[PDB]
A paper describes a structure:
pmcTransmembrane β-barrel (TMB) nanopores formed by a circularly closed single β-sheet provide rigid scaffolds for the transport of molecules across cellular and organelle membranes. Encouraged by the success in designing these narrow TMBs, we reasoned that de novo protein design should provide a general approach to creating robust β-barrel nanopore scaffolds for a next generation of nanopore sensors. We set out to develop general methods to overcome these challenges and design stable monomeric channels with tunable pore shapes, sizes, and single-channel conductance. Our results demonstrate that it is possible to systematically design transmembrane β-barrels with conducting pores spanning a range of sizes and shapes.
To modulate the size of the pore, we increased the number of β-strands (10, 12, and 14 strands) while keeping the transmembrane span and the connectivity between β-strands (the shear number) constant. The first-generation backbones corresponding to these designs were assembled with the Rosetta BlueprintBDR application and had similar cylindrical shapes. Such cylindrical β-sheet configurations are strained as a result of repulsion between side chains packing the barrel lumen. Glycine kinks (glycine residues in extended positive-φ conformation) were introduced into the blueprint to relieve the strain and to bend the β-strands to form corners in the β-barrel cross section. In the water-accessible pore, networks of polar residues were designed around the canonical TMB folding motif Tyr-Gly-Asp/Glu to optimize strong local β-register–defining interactions while alternating with patches of hydrophobic and small, disorder-promoting residues (Gly, Ala, Ser). On the lipid-exposed surface, design calculations favored Ser and Thr in close proximity to a glycine kink where they could form a hydrogen bond to the β-strand backbone, effectively mimicking the backbone-water hydrogen bonds observed in strongly bent β-strands of water-soluble β-barrels. Although it is perhaps counterintuitive to expose hydroxyl groups to the lipid environment, we included a small number of these amino acids on the lipid-exposed surface instead of hydrophobic β-branched residues to further reduce the β-sheet propensity. As previously observed for eight-stranded TMBs, a delicate balance between the optimization of tertiary structure energy and negative design (introduction of locally frustrated residues) to disfavor premature β-strand formation before membrane insertion was critical for the expression of the larger TMB nanopores in E. coli inclusion bodies. Despite the inversion of the hydrophobic exterior and polar core compared with globular proteins and the almost entirely local nature of the side chain interactions, our approach enables TMB design with atomic level precision, as highlighted by the close agreement between the experimentally determined crystal and NMR structures and the corresponding design models.
Residue numbers in the entry: 5 to 147
The structure:
């Protein structure tokens, strides 16, 4: 249930960040999954940051699921990630989506969820931020 994970992000303006956190996921319904996570992030530009996010996956079809992520950070920055996850293979799925903020300017992104071995799942996120930069993140969790 509770998986420790580490995030590693790089942006086209050479701003990097490393995060450490845990995620506990529950199954509220047979086609509905919820998740809560908290992490500590160290950044190139803003030093330290703490973020708390809630996730949810709702089955839309046999291999499609609606994913939502709500995140708020200690620097008073928040966002909303809404994506549709398509399961391609038993250990492979893609989830193109968009990030929302009160500052508007919806930011498109894509997640690639794959399992590197039995006890490791990796989530690769490629997002296009509102500052015209591109951020590539690598999330590794211990299954």
């Amino acid at each position: 249930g509770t998986k420790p994970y580490v995030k590693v992000r790089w942006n086209t303006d050479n701003t990097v960040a490393v995060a450490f956190g845990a995620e506990t996921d529950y199954k509220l319904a047979p086609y509905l999954k919820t998740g809560v996570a908290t992490e500590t992030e160290y950044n190139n530009s803003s030093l330290v940051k703490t973020g708390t996010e809630v996730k949810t996956a709702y089955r839309l079809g046999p291999n499609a699921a609606l994913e939502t992520v709500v995140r708020y950070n200690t620097d008073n920055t928040f966002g909303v990630e809404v994506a549709i996850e398509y399961r391609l293979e038993p250990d492979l799925s893609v989830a193109p989506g968009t990030r929302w903020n009160n500052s508007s300017l919806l930011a498109p992104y894509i997640k690639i969820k794959y399992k590197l071995g039995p006890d490791l799942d990796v989530v690769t996120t490629i997002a296009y931020n509102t500052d015209n930069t591109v951020g590539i993140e690598t999330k590794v969790a211990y299954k």
